[PDB]
């Protein structure tokens, strides 16, 4: 229970040196409040509080597997086979950028991804539990001859 004391001391030093002085003889209750808050954990804002753990289905980006990267390379290497002012600022070589995205990139640089957009964008049990605890699920309907599956309406 002395570790608590040294811990709160460290949090005090942290806030005192982090925010430029401002500690002073005044604001002592404010210092105690921020010490308690940073000791317990991270103070969330309201937007961070209502942020769902479950991402939106549109928020999951595509990540190609190696075979789909091969399909992309084949498509890009197949495809193809005015005053400078009005020319758009994005006037680069489309084929070169597409092929330099099929290599490296973000959708093509995992080398382990397998149905990254089909798995995900799909509720699992833990994500359904998080959505229900956040009050985001309107109705749960048990179906099947065994009643081990639900059709959750959010």
């Amino acid at each position: 229970e002395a570790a608590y004391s040294a811990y709160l001391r460290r949090i005090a030093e942290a806030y005192l040196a982090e925010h430029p002085q401002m500690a002073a003889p005044e604001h002592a209750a404010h210092v105690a409040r921020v010490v308690r808050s940073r000791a317990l954990g991270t103070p969330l804002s309201f937007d961070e509080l209502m942020r769902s753990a479950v991402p939106a289905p549109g928020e999951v980006p595509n990540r190609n597997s190696r075979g789909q990267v091969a399909e992309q390379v084949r498509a890009i290497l197949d495809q193809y086979d005015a005053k400078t002012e009005d020319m758009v600022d994005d006037a680069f070589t489309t084929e070169v950028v597409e092929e330099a995205m099929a290599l490296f990139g973000d959708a093509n640089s995992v080398k382990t991804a397998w149905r990254t957009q089909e798995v995900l964008r799909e509720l699992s049990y833990t994500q359904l539990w998080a959505l229900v605890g956040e009050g985001h699920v309107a109705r749960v309907r048990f179906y099947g001859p065994e009643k081990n599956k639900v059709m959750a309406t959010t």
């Binding site: 608590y4 309201f46 509080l49 209502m50």
Partner: protein, 500 residues
Amino acid sequence: EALLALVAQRVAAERMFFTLEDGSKVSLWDLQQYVDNNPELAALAASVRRIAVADPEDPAGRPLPGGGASGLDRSRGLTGAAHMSGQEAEELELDWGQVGRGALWRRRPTRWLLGGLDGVKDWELEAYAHEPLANQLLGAKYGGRDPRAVVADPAYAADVLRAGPLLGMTFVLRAARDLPLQEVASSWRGLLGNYLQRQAPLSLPKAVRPAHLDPTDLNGVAWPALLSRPAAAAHAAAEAEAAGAVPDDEMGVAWRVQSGKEAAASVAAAQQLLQSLPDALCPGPSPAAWPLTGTKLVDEGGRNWRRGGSVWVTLQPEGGVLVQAQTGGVVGEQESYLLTHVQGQEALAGAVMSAFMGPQPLDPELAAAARSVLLVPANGFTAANKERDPNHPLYPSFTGVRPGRAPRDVAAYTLAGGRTPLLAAGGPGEAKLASELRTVMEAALAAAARAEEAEAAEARRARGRAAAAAVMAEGLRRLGPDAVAMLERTAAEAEAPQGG
């Protein structure tokens, strides 16, 4: 300009205050800003999200142990009505117990035809009464008597018709069909006009104490201080005789008669307020301009009232009729709307009460069931067993102990020490211990008489109570735990069921 000296000045500086818990007073403008201009917290409020507190006196967080899954919270997925465990219904006020069921039939289902295939139901009728007020009124007069004799007397029927606003009889009419608006308005207007044509000049209460809830303590009430006065009954009677002194039995209420329900006045005024039903509910022809539109109480076009919506008609005293409503379906999506609230219309409250519990009601089964249930809150029991009383007339609570069967064995029967309560009443031990308790009580009564306007009398009663408690306690330590049990059962089987 637009009341720039009147809509400003923070409406009389908002000199009306509230009172939260530890006597803290907050302004109505502050509270209105808290419900209006603080909508981030309302986003949590309409999401039933669980957060759980942290312990403030703990060095290491430690989320405080709470059980919050209260009846309203768990019931949000149910349909029609919520569900609690009795104790949670005892909390959150919730004191309007159901006294009767009924139905407003279009064509009454016959047991012949095809089982009742002509049984069109327009509304389901339920009646609710304030159980503490039902006890306080119908229990100190019609309590401890034969309930069959009470419900047989025409004076009890007259009294439950007269004291209806006092009981706060609220009738819930739940729509069992997609009813057209004009048909329902015409039916209710015709029925209430027919019952207003027979509303003779009859009896109404008169006020014995004014005021209460001054514009500094709108959160508070005057009745606990009124009932916990240093003399109570004496003060109340003194107020009574300085205005309307109770002529009846132990009920209160002075009951002015006849003229109170004027004829060319409030009865005719109500016959006009009923005429302003189909020009206040279905106004000039535009089903999007009719007040009850858009809300879930009607359909999309507003022509018909949706099945499952309910209309709550509460009869307040002083002729106040409060018509609210509530949509049907999932209670987590139900929205309640206040429709109207009329004050001073003594003919409307009396006419609705006669229409529901009169000599010819809208439902004789509902009227008989309500007038018959009301003796159960009158006898201090409530309609539903909220207090979990084992001696309830209907739905009694069980002890949760398995009944004992005497075995045909010898090893089960053991002759232990003095660890059995006395169960044989009338024996010599019971009689002699009753005699010893009798001499202890007589010593207590003798010792309470030496303890030496109505406030000093109550102080003397408190001193006598202290001396009697001392002498009785010494005598009960002289006697045994069986004598403690006998004193407890003697005190239990001596008070009236009404609690007086």
